[PDB]
């Protein structure tokens, strides 16, 4: 919660592409049921994986410029960045257990 | 993009129940076209903005035919939303003094043999009586 | 004041994201829209605040696959509030949109197959996100 990075279009290159360690970016919007559904799950993961992973969120309604650059055409979309490059992609709602499976398999 | 759906129904003609084929051509800008066939012969065609309106135009052209379909039943009518969102394919089977519920929804071309030997005008007039019965 | 509403349709999102939702006619009478929006052709587009109420219409009664569209607008009229106890299909939770819905105001589309199961992601309108 207090550990989630709240991105903007302006802060994306700094806080994601130039970040140290793995960054999980959630592309999301307040009007999307599947987006709101995974929201508190990401808060759990942000605490459980602290020191192994940074969780960041990009709200596409306030920040319409970033998602097109990564070919993102649907939400929710999770992009896993490592050292400035996309290391994995997961599109769509999932449970806490499904999310931890995707993370453990990519970290 | 243009969608084309098809549907077989029963109709009564000269006391002879017979099977008809419907083609539903949904083209851009809410143009709905309803064609009806018997043994590859086109009996009629109607063009309108939703299929419940198309169906009513179709039954008015063929007044000598009873259409054994929910869409012809005297107490079936679409809501504004069902007309708008499903192109009138989904409608409600109503009862005097009761608002329309989800479980009252019907497909206008599902089979029905009761209360269907009526004109589109009689159906439309019952619907006004139903609407006014809700107060 | 802006609200999120939903609309079902079998028409593809390519067509909808481009053309928006248009009305049948000029009649701005909301009571007559509820009685019969084809006679006279009404100047309102129907949407709902309950996304589950779109499924039956989007699939044409479980017969076809379709889409649930999500919109953001600020001019809708709450039909149940406006008609009160006279509201003929109050379970639809209808918000009527005077004049229609601009293509720009349709935020996204979510696929629904014939058995009512929706996809777990929303496709974005490129007019707003492309």
Swiss-Prot record, chain A:
The modification N6-acetyllysine is found at residue 69. InterPro entries: Thioredoxin, Thioredoxin-like_sf, Thioredoxin_CS, Thioredoxin_domain. GO terms for cellular component: cytoplasm; cytosol. GO terms for molecular function: DNA polymerase processivity factor activity; protein-disulfide reductase activity. Pfam families: Thioredoxin. Disulfide bonds join 32-35. Residues 1-107 form the Thioredoxin domain. Monomer. Interacts with bacteriophage T3 DNA polymerase. Participates in various redox reactions through the reversible oxidation of its active center dithiol to a disulfide and catalyzes dithiol-disulfide exchange reactions. This is Thioredoxin 1. It comes from Escherichia coli (strain K12). The gene is trxA.
